[PDB]
Amino acid sequence: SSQIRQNYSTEVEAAVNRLVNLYLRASYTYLSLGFYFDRDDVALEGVCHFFRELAFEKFEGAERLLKMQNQRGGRALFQDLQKPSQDEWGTTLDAMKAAIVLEKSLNQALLDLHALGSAQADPHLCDFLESHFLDEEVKLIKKMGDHLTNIQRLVGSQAGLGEYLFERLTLKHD
Amino acid sequence: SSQIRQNYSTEVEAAVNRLVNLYLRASYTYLSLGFYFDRDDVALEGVCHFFRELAFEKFEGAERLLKMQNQRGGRALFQDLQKPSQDEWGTTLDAMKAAIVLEKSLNQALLDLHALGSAQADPHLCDFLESHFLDEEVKLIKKMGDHLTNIQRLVGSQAGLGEYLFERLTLKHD
Amino acid sequence: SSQIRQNYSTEVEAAVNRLVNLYLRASYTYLSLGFYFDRDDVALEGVCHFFRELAFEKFEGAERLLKMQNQRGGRALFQDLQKPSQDEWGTTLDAMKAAIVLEKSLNQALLDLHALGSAQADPHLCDFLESHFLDEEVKLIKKMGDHLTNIQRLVGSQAGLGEYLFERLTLKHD
Amino acid sequence: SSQIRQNYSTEVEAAVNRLVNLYLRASYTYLSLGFYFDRDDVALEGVCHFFRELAFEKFEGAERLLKMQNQRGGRALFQDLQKPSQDEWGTTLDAMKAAIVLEKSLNQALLDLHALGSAQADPHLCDFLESHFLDEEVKLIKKMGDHLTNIQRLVGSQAGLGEYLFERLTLKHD
Amino acid sequence: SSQIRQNYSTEVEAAVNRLVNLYLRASYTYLSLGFYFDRDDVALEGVCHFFRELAFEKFEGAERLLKMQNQRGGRALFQDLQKPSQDEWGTTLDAMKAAIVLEKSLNQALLDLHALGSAQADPHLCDFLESHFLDEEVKLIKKMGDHLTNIQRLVGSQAGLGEYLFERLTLKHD
Amino acid sequence: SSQIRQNYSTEVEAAVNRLVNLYLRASYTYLSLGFYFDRDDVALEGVCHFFRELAFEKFEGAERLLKMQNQRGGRALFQDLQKPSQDEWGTTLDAMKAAIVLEKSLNQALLDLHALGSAQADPHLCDFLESHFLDEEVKLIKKMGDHLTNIQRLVGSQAGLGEYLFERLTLKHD
Ligand SMILES: [Cl-]
Ligand SMILES: [Cl-]
Ligand SMILES: [Cl-]
Ligand SMILES: [Cl-]
Ligand SMILES: [Cl-]
Ligand SMILES: [Cl-]
Predict the structure, then answer these.
(1) Cβ-count burial C64-76 (b if 16+ within 10 Å, e if not)
(2) Neighbour tally for C43: CB within 10 Å
(3) How many helices (H) and strands (E) does chain B have?
(4) C-alpha distances in Å from residue E41, one per residue of C12, D143, E166, F165
(5) Sequence-separated (6 or more) residues with CB below 8 Å from residue E144
(6) Nearest-angstrom CA–CA distance, A147 and A166
(7) Which residues in chain D are closer than 8 Å to B7, comparing Cβ atoms?
(8) Ramachandran region of residue A76, left (φ > 0), alpha (ψ -120 to 50) or beta?
(9) How far apart are CA E46 and CA E171, in angstroms?
């Protein structure tokens, strides 16, 4: 069949395609989050920029998976990409909570694929995830948790003031 | 009559002169807004600077219209310039609300002139407005709406604190 | 309702959201085309690079439309993104034919939206499309037609040789 | 028929070819004007240079139209180019009057083609003319009218002195 | 009342507002003069540039007065700005005569305000006018008188030739 | 009659005007050849560029002849410029064959004019042609013959492949 394929299971090939779908879904979710915060009636530039940057980061993860699929001799298969779970994302707090939920779901999918690779004795796959995905996800989730704690401490009894200050003094703007 | 005039209606010529009056009136309004915020009993430098910059921008729009009037062979006609609608402009919120009202009025005058040009089959006029006025106005109104949303979120129950923070962390000063 | 919206119809707002979907669908189609040509059993780097660049270009078009939607006071609404029409794209000729069909479809959607804007007397919309989309599309379709003619002249009776030479001597690589 | 042609009428295609003929005729007229002023018995270098520069400018307009014809999928068709209307061009005043008449005729042809494009719902054509021809023509006609006024004010009762001074102090020489 | 106001009479405050009106009226007069000389049927670039520069200079004088009003604790009050005294300004000579009349009127208003300040024992006001207005006005009136003498010497029996030569060899152009 | 004319026959003056017509006709032929090869259904950039460069070169020859006519005291006389002999130019081979035929015709006209100058004892004319035209034409015809031989050797039994390779590997592009 394939001239280069070696030690690459059909199970891993399919899970890789599924993970591409998840990362592209996540990228699309972040595009929607970013543009919501650019609305004139939301207007939080640093929050917009944060999520637009994450849309690109998730796309780059999908791109790396597609490069790897071909390096291994599998075949990329694309599926429909479902729209994000919400049209309007509420407050910065609500948005950051949704993002952490999204990231935990990508992380579990990475861990599930790592376990499949381990079970199939596919060390290239396992190394690929360890080298380019697992620590990146851990670092991002830590950042998001740090942000959640700071957003929550700023709510107090003046939510608008806190949401403005977080965007201006923590998030980068521009 | 004119050695260069071609496809330039008397209706457009007159509307151009009227629009110069509107832009100069707007420039004068912004001069008054700017100096109000420089009062020792208002003292919001970033707000002053914002409006003084807009006084210059509106003047430059009037200047471009006057250059174009001559390029087309029409004759600039100047009228009395009415004073701004207020002597004192209230809070930054009140001022930004007045500015958005002013900008919507200039925008409608641009759109009305574009429609006249379209009706008169004057594509140079229509292009001129599209290339140097329509998008500039859209961008400015979006900026002003973003500012309004941020000012409103900062009012809460501590209006002075919010007005200070907006001027310091959003408006340019320095 | 909206503090900035002016001369922006619900019909244009909805068509803009539909056009974002079309551009993102096109971007996804080009991602699939690009990775197909990176397969070890296809291996045409310049063709891969051509289509991956177009995936980014179509994404940037969607991004510009989303920025504009917000500048005008409309609300971005995202829908499901359908998968590309094919999983395997055949020869470079077949792929370039599919791309020209795709581009003609985006072009017609641009022209349809321009006509709606003209009918609604929305010159900002019309200018936006003229300034950032119509000529870009015309230039791209011309390029693709030039490529089709060169690919076709190279088929003769030695198709593989011609497909290699086109990728090496016309398309940028590496 | 054509693999790239879309929304491009036969009427516009033919009018574009006609406009190429007009621009090349105008270029040839300016070549003749330029060399007349280089005659030893006329010897007005700045006037020669002015018209030779315009010969190139009109050629570049024809070249842009030909590029566009191909970008749109139309076919350039060339016709005989008629010689200029005069062999000898009189005074600088006579020449500048002939040039303004020529430019008004090109301008009307641009406006006529714009109107045809508008009628045919061809916004690429209309934008192309607005972006690269309408304002260039308006600016040139204004310049020529400014020159005519200065030449006329210099005639008085010493025509030769005035013609020399205009060439030396207004026209560029080197 | 005011937290900073000291030794600043209501009479000076009001006269300062009146002088702002005069300077803005003068600025508007110079804008009209400048654009008249940019007409295709007048076409004297150096004269246009001279008056457009003076429009800016008079605006800057108004701006300095407004800054000072606030520095002293007075309140800027803006009034309607009357249109210039003429729609068409005749020859360069006629225009320069009107400008010298205008400048003498601003100068007398400066001297009147200086005398009021002296009478009110307001040395800051008097110094402000001496340091930023009195000598600037004297220098400008001298320049304008030098220009008038040169324009008059050039009229002789060839007015157009003289008006051209003055614009080309004295006034700055490009 | 002429203050500078010396040793310049009416026969040479007229032949110079005729040669200007021939060079401009040739320039127009090359403009048509160039744009034919820019058609989306021909698409040979290096061939387009080759002929567009020759259109400019032939124009420059006409310009040099016109400069010389005036240097000698003759009078440039322009005639109608006939359209090129074909609307469509076939293959690169067909086009290069037509160009060599065109160049041989210009060369014979140069040689005929040189012989007239020799007969009229006009050494300035003869030197002018020797210094700026005869060797330029010989070099160009040699280049074109070298191109013809290479195009012919590439036809074999795969004409499209050969036409592509010639354009990519010999003609400058990209
Ligand atoms: Cl499906
Ligand atoms: Cl009045
Ligand atoms: Cl759904
Ligand atoms: Cl014919
Ligand atoms: Cl009033
Ligand atoms: Cl004839």
Answers:
(1) ebbebbbbbbbbb
(2) 13
(3) 6, 0
(4) 45, 11, 17, 60
(5) E96, E99, E100, E103
(6) 9
(7) 107-108, 111
(8) beta
(9) 5
Output the six-digit token pair for B50. Answer: 């914002």
**Which residues are registered as beta bridge partners of C81?**
A81
The residues near D100 (Cβ < 8 Å, ≥ 6 apart) are B3, B4, D141, D144, D145, D148
- The gap from C-alpha E62 to its chain's centroid, in whole angstroms, comes to 10
| Ligand nearest to the CA of residue F85, numbered in listed order | 4
CA of residue C51 relative to chain centroid, distance: 10
Q: What interhelical angle do C45-72 and C135-155 show, nearest 10?
A: 160
| F81: β partners | D81
Nearest ligand, CA F82? 4
C–F contact: 3+ Cβ pairs < 8 A: yes
Close Cβ partners of F107 (under 8 Å, ≥ 6 residues apart): F137, F138, F141
Q: Chain A partners of B170 at a C-beta cutoff of 8 Å?
A: 168
Amino acid at F104: K
Cβ contact B142–A40 (<8 Å): yes
**Rounded distance, CA A28 to CA C76, Å?**
13
Positive or negative, the CA dihedral A67, A73, A79, A85 is negative
Q: What is the DSSP string of D100-119?
A: HHHHHHHHHHHHHHHHHHHH
How is residue C1 written in tokens?
Answer: 């309702």
**Cα A80 to averaged position of ligand 1 atoms, centre (Å):** 6
Way it was determined: X-ray
| CA–CA distances in Å: residue A144 to residues A102, A108, A131, C99, F1 | 11, 16, 21, 40, 93
Distance A88 CA to ligand 1 centre (A): 27
CA distances from A113 to A14, A66, A105, A107, A129 (A): 10, 15, 12, 10, 9
Place of tokens 């210039």: E84
How far the first Cα of chain F sits from its last, in Å, is 53
Identify the H or E element spanning F163.
Answer: helix F159-169
* Region at A61 (left for phi over 0; alpha for psi -120 to 50; beta for the rest): alpha
Transcribe E47-102 into DSSP letters: HHHHHHHHHHHHHHHHHHHHHHHHHHT-------BPPPS-S---SHHHHHHHHHHH
Rg (CA), chain B: 18
